[PDB]
Amino acid sequence: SKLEAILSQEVEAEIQALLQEAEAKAEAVKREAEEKAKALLQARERALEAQYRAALRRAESAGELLVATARTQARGEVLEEVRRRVREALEALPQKPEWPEVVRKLALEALEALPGAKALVANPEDLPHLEAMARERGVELQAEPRLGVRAVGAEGKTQVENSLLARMDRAWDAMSSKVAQALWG
């Protein structure tokens, strides 16, 4: 029957269009993925690349802080040594053949700062030396505080002194600057 023959070819020709519809609707699915994956893995390469350099920045920034400390660590080992030698130098002064000469220098120097003045102080490390302006001036030498000289004036008043080590903490603290340049010039 040729009439239904045409119904076959027609229906069958419809089959051929359904399958093709599917194929393209599959190919687009296949290609939807190909892009979908490409677009995420690109995005996860990005995030990791930052997770690299910015990590390395904080690593590089660390090393400079270890080098900076390292250097500051070294300068302290030096600067403290220069401190000891100034102290050692001030502590080896008494047994040197130049110590009595210095004695009344600071004794007189303070004596000027206290114009009134009743008496003065000092160790047997020094005091005995005070005979020069012990004969002259006031003549009061009584007390014991061993590196430095003090004074008491206005009968009592505020008893002003002058410690030899108090000169260091001032003068060291001041031109600790001229010293650091002199060192690393």
Partner: protein, 100 residues
């Protein structure tokens, strides 16, 4: 009269069309599976990437310390030595200020 002819042929066609639509829809259910597989295994590739991103980072950051620290050991010493030489004078200056 034959009725069946026109009423049976009318079935085979309908059930071949039925059969067409499904086997069609499977090819999509097939590609839908591949659509997952291609994503799952893309999740994998990137996972393997992280490895290198953390690992190469390890090896270089571990190396970066070596190079920086051994420059810390080097530069710190070379600043001691700079002082060492000129050191007598530092005291010479400090001692002179306090003396008078």
């Amino acid at each position: 009269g034959l009725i069946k002819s026109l009423a049976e042929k009318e079935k085979q066609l309908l059930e071949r069309l039925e059969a067409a639509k499904k086997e069609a829809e499977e090819r999509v259910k097939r590609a839908e599976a591949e659509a997952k597989a291609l994503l799952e295994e893309a999740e994998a590739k990137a996972k393997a990437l992280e490895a290198q991103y953390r690992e190469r980072e390890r090896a270089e950051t571990e190396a970066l310390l070596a190079r920086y620290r051994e420059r810390a050991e080097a530069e710190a010493k070379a600043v001691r030595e700079k002082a060492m030489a000129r050191l007598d004078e530092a005291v010479a200056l400090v001692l002179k200020e306090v003396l008078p």
